[PDB]
Amino acid sequence: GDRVADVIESSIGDSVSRALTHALPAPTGQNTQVSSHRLDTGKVPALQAAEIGASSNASDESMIETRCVLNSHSTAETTLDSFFSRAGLVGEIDLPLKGTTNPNGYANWDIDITGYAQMRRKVELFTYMRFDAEFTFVACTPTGEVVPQLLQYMFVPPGAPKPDSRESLAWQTATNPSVFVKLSDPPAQVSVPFMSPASAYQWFYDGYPTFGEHKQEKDLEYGACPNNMMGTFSVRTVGTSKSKYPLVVRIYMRMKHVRAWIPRPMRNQNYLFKANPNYAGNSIKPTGASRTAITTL
Amino acid sequence: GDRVADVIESSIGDSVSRALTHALPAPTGQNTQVSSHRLDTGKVPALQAA
Amino acid sequence: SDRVAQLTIGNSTITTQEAANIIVGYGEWPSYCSDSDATAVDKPTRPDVSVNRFYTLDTKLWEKSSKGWYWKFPDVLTETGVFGQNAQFHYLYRSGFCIHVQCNASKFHQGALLVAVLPEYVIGTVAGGTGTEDTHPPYKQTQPGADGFELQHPYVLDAGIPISQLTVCPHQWINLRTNNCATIIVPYINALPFDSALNHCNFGLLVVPISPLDYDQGATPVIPITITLAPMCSEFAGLRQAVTQ
Amino acid sequence: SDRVAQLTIGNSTITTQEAANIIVGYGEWPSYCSDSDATAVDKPTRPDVSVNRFYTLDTKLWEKSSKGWYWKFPDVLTETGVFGQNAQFHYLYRSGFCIHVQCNASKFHQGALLVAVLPEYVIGTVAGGTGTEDTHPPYKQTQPGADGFELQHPYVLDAGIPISQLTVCPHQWINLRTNNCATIIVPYINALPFDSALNHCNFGLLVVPISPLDYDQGATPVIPITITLAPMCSEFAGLRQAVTQ
Amino acid sequence: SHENSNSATEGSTINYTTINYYKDSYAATAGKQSLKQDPDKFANPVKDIFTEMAAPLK
Amino acid sequence: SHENSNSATEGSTINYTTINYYKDSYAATAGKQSLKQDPDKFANPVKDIFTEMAAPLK
Ligand SMILES: CCO/N=C/c1ccc(OCC[C@@H](C)CCN2CCN(c3ccncc3)C2=O)cc1
Ligand SMILES: [Cl-]
Ligand SMILES: [Cl-]
């Protein structure tokens, strides 16, 4: 039991996150109301105090005489799903014949979509994101040609054996999900759930993944968070002999059922690496176009 | 007829000259009322803003 | 009646006679983790008053040429008071914060500081200048401790992002002709119910002069900026021996 | 709450944080001419928003030796904006006005301007100095246009009348230690329901320093006085070709 | 359709309307969602809110 | 079918009958429309209409 007053009247423990604001429906843009000339002392909408940290609450109606306008412009196209549920390139896998990279008939792709600017800049607008996704795999030769080749794609989650060759025992794929398809067939396409161990993936992790002294050698792990590492995507020509043709697989991702939290300033310097926000120091450019003077267009 | 909102709610045309003051009768000079010492903070008749 | 305020929590009280309201980050107050969101099974410890109080950690000098600084939470308190001890003895930690940046001058000084909070504030390097070197920021820079760290390139917040858009984050301004402090309440922000106070900095505090300090020869030239902050609804779990990193 | 104000009319808005209330000339608001007072039979045109708005016409510099100036209504707007056009195309015109004289300084400057409105402000000449010459003021002086005209002998308002009694007219003062603007609403004043905006100036605006401007070497010496005004309830009738005078 | 509730948006304030042919909910289309929005969360997160006609600092 | 009302003819006097399989209405077939027509709009837009048996100019 609890008998001492400070304990009874304590707030220690309420899990109810009291919120100052709530969402209202807004299918269309706000209408404009008729307004007239106001010559008052005391009331002053135009004057603000930006130091407070809130945006101006001054409206059209109070700054000029307005007419009535019934605004039925839709706000549907700016929802997260409308913005993100458009498939874009996030990975390329090369399977050349007599080359340097993969002359063995197979390839392992670390599942990381940060190798392409377009898609990357979009998702990096938010800090945390939770979503399902539709992946489409387009394959063809380097000339965009289609040939009668059978391929096998396999998802190798963290902990599963990564194939070390075109003939690796791992391709038995008894538990991992695999897809067999011909280049002649249409692009393979599957749905992928939200697989993180966290409640959301995060494009930014200001921290280290483990304890201990964080000496120079291990500074490569700064910002690396396992909750964002979903695994490996392996592909191979299905055979015991080298394929007769060189191949390329372009991976497209289309997010769906999206939720995001914490907006961030949008990237304004060229991207350099997948794992970090490093930018070219001798080449810091302004965010946009510049002009000769502040008094001339 | 008038259908557009700004026209309905318009003031264009009122001939009524709204006045801030009106005349009261005053046949004689104003009387003087008894008054006592006031030592208040807040109330300040003597101070003006010409 | 909005320019005057008092913040009392624990055995500490702050006063200001030139405030500009209070910001409550993302519109919500700090709160303890519910039994639904929680996942770890051990009963947490909630020290309350011994740790949820105002700690005044550091003072910087504002100069006509200052670039701006940043501090990281909870990195700043990990070695201070009873809060620090709990952060070290426990694996798991979570709390909110009440931040109060102070900076007063005179009615003849001018200048404006942008005080903001940026969740998951990852730092980048200039990549060897040419962008061909894959360098990484050292521990001393990602977790600067109480001393904070000075920004190298404010325009891009040392992370390839425009400071012009930093206002999309909870923030206030300290415009010397208007107020002498900023106050921001921040709730726990993370994709997990609890986390390590040591390996993960939930957010960063940025204090950057957007409008340079100025005054005439003869006015006090030493204008300090002091950082005071208080954890809120601190919870700790996963007890063991003390660990500093 | 009386020192702060906002005037919005048309597509124009004025703000002030150091006002001293608002004067409504002779205690009554501008209003359109009633069907009883009217005499001309043609249906008038009432442009509304395109002409009843704030026009900022002129700026003068206040100096330790300035004498004071005057402007005439509606002469000041006859060649400006849509209002001017209507004044030119129509024989008949009538309207009220909202006048807002602006002049700010610093808490270290001093001085007081008397801002008044004088109906039927007829100008006189010094009659050859001896009073034996029956001279008359030239068009440029009776209707100075937007540039206004400087008073020759303020004490007698260039018309043989004491400025000491000018306060018997709608007015306000701009006392630098108190306010930085004067606002006066004026209704149509005339012995006829409508009249020519060209041949007749219903009233004059006078801005005269009664207490001379002063300050110490080193304070901004350029102290402007800007005149902004807005017609109210403008009505025009008797359309024909445009005429400038 | 009686399937598995494994969509990323299961238990979300915004009501979705989708199509699906598999036992797993995340395989469904993106569909249409509710058009609610809360600007104040980011544009006006002040403790004591001020009115449009008042002087923000008093 | 509960979809988006983004067809070019949404809010049109002529009643359409169409088929569709997507959430967006404009993806629908052309269908059949109402057979109303108003010739007079172009062939007889006179202010004061005259009868067939009368002398048009009187
Ligand atoms: C039969 C084989 O078919 N399987 C296809 C497949 C496709 C995608 C799969 O997982 C995709 C997971 C991605 C949506 C995760 C992308 N993310 C999550 C956050 N993140 C990231 C990257 C770099 N820094 C921080 C976060 C990412 O790159 C798994 C299998
Ligand atoms: Cl200590
Ligand atoms: Cl013009």
For chain E, the domains span 1-58
Pick the CATH number of A1-297 from 3.10.270.10, 2.60.120.20, 2.30.30.60, 3.10.310.30: 2.60.120.20
Name the residue ranges covered by the structural domains of chain C: 1-245
Residues 6+ apart with CB under 8 A from C217: none
- Among A274, A278, A273, A281, which Cα is nearest to C130's? A281
Q: How far apart are CA B19 and CA D99, in angstroms?
A: 19
Whose Cα sits closest to atom 24 in ligand 1?
Answer: A203
CA-nearest of C95, C101, C80 to C31 is C95
Q: Which amino acid is at A252?
A: Y
Supply angle C-alpha C226, C232, C233, rounded to 5: 165
CA-based nearest residue in chain A for residue E39: A23
- Residue D146 tokens read as 């937007």
Shortest Cα distance from E1 to chain A (angstroms)?
18
- The label of the residue with tokens 């006392």 reads D175
C-alpha–C-alpha distance, residues D205 and D91, integer Å = 24
Chain B CB contacts of A31 below 8 Å: none
Using CA atoms, how far residue A20 sits from A11, C29, C30, E58, in Å, is 19, 8, 12, 22
How many residues are recorded in chain F?
A: 58
b (16+ CB within 10 A) / e for A186-216: eebeebbbbebebbbbbbbbbbbbeeeebee
Q: How far apart, in whole angstroms, are the C-alpha atoms of residue D199 and residue D245?
A: 7
| 3-class DSSP string for chain A | CCCCHHHHCCCCCCCCCCECCCCEECCECCCECCCCCEEEECCCCCCCCHHHCCCCCCCHHHHCCCCCECCCCECHHHCHHHHHCCCEEEEEEEECCCCCCCCCCEEEEECCCCCCHHHHHHHCCEEEEEEEEEEEEEEECCCCCCCCCEEEEEEECCCCCCCCCCCCHHHHCCCCCEEEEECCCCCEEEEECCCCCCCCEECCCCECCCCCCCCHHHHHHCCCCHHHCCCEEEEEECCCCCCCCCEEEEEEEEEEEEEEEEECCCCCCCCCCCCCCCCCHHHCCCCCCCCCCCCCC
How remote is the C-alpha of D141 from its chain's centroid? 15
CATH class of F1-58: few secondary structures
Please identify among residues 4-33 of chain B the ones whose CB lies closer than 8 Å to any CB of chain D. Answer: 10, 12-21
Ramachandran angles phi, psi of F19, nearest 5°: -120, 145
At position C99, the amino acid (one-letter code) is I
- What's the CA gap between A269 and D205, in Å, rounded? 58
Separation CA A204–CA A125 (nearest Å): 11
Q: Is the CB of A190 under 6 A from ligand 1?
A: yes
Contact E57 C26 (CB under 8 A): no
CB contact under 8 A, D31 and B12: no
Half-sphere exposure of D121 (CA within 13 A, CB side): 28
Q: H or E element: which one contains E41?
A: helix E40-43
Cis peptide before A193 (omega within 30 of 0): no
Asked if residue C119 lies in contact with residue C206, where contact means CB atoms within 8 angstroms, the answer is no
- CB of C207 closer than 8 Å to CB of C173: no
Interface contact E58-C1, CB threshold 8 A: yes
Cα–Cα nearest to D102, from D184, D23, D9, D163: D184
Type of residue numbered B3: R
Return the SS3 of D27.
helix
User: Is the CB of F6 inside 8 Å of chain E's CB atoms?
Assistant: no
In chain A, residues with a C-beta closer than 8 Å to the C-beta of D4 are 41-42, 44, 47
Give all strands of the β-sheet with C171-175 in edge-to-edge order. Answer: C149-150, C69-73, C203-214, C110-119, C171-175
Which of C33, C7, C22, C123 shows the shortest CA–CA distance to C72? C123
CA distances from C68 to A159, C61, C206, C225, F54 (A): 44, 10, 7, 11, 91
Please tell me what resolution, in angstroms, this structure has.
2.8
Q: What are the CA-CA distances from residue A136 to residues A109, D148, E32 (Å)?
A: 15, 76, 22
Strands C55-62 and A126-140, how do they pair? unpaired
A chain contacts of residue C37, beta-carbon cutoff 8 Å: 15
Chain B residues whose CB is inside 8 A of the A36 CB are: 9, 11
Question: Which DSSP letter does residue F19 get?
Answer: -
The structure was resolved experimentally with X-ray
Question: Which pair of structure tokens corresponds to residue F16?
Answer: 């359409």
Q: Which ligand 1 atom minimizes the distance to the CA of A205? A: 25
Pair D164, D200: CB distance under 8 Å: no
Does the beta carbon of A232 sit less than 6 angstroms from any atom of ligand 1?
Answer: no
Query: At D230, which helix (H) or strand (E)?
Result: strand D223-239
Query: How far apart are the C-alpha atoms of C223 and C106, rounded to whole Å?
Result: 10
Which residue reads 């109330």 in tokens? B43
C-alpha–C-alpha distance, residues A139 and A180, integer Å: 12
Q: Is C116 on the interface with E (CB under 8 A)?
A: no
Going from the C-alpha of F55 to that of each of D54, F49, F50, F52, the distances in angstroms are 60, 12, 8, 8
Distance CA D2, CA D119 (A): 28
d(CA C205, CA C198): 17
The answer to whether C23 and C101 are in contact (CB under 8 A) is no
Closest C-alpha residue for ligand 1 atom 10: A230
Query: Of the bound ligands, which one is closest to the alpha carbon of residue D146?
Result: 3
E42 close to C (CB below 8 A) = yes
Ramachandran category for residue D164: left, alpha or beta (phi over 0 → left; psi -120 to 50 → alpha):
alpha
Paired tokens of E16: 């979705």
Please enumerate in sequence order all residues whose Cβ is within 8 A of that of C64, keeping only pairs 6 or more positions apart, or say none. Answer: C212, C213, C214
CATH number, domain C1-245:
2.60.120.20
Cα D215 to Cα D110: distance, rounded to the nearest angstrom: 7
| Cβ atoms of A195 and A133 closer than 8 Å | no
What is residue D152's DSSP assignment?
A: S
Beta bridge partners of A138: A250
Q: What is the 3-state secondary structure (H, E, C) of chain C?
A: CCCCEEEEECCEEEEECCCCCCEEHHHECCCCCCCCCCCCCCCCECCHHHCCCCEEEEEEEECCCCCCEEEEECCCCCCCHHHHHHHHHEEEEEEEEEEEEECCCCCCCEEEEEEEEEECCCCCCCCCCCCCCCCCCCHHHHCCHHHCEECCCHHHCCCCCCHHHHHHCCEEEEECCCCCEEEEEECCCCCCCCECCCCECCEEEEEEEEEEEECCECECCCEEEEEEEEEEEEEEEEECCCCCC
CA dihedral D121, D126, D127, D128 (to 10 degrees): -150
Rounded CA-CA distance D45/D234 in Å is 9
CA A95 centroid distance within chain: 27
Measured from the Cα of A195, ligand 1's closest atom is 12
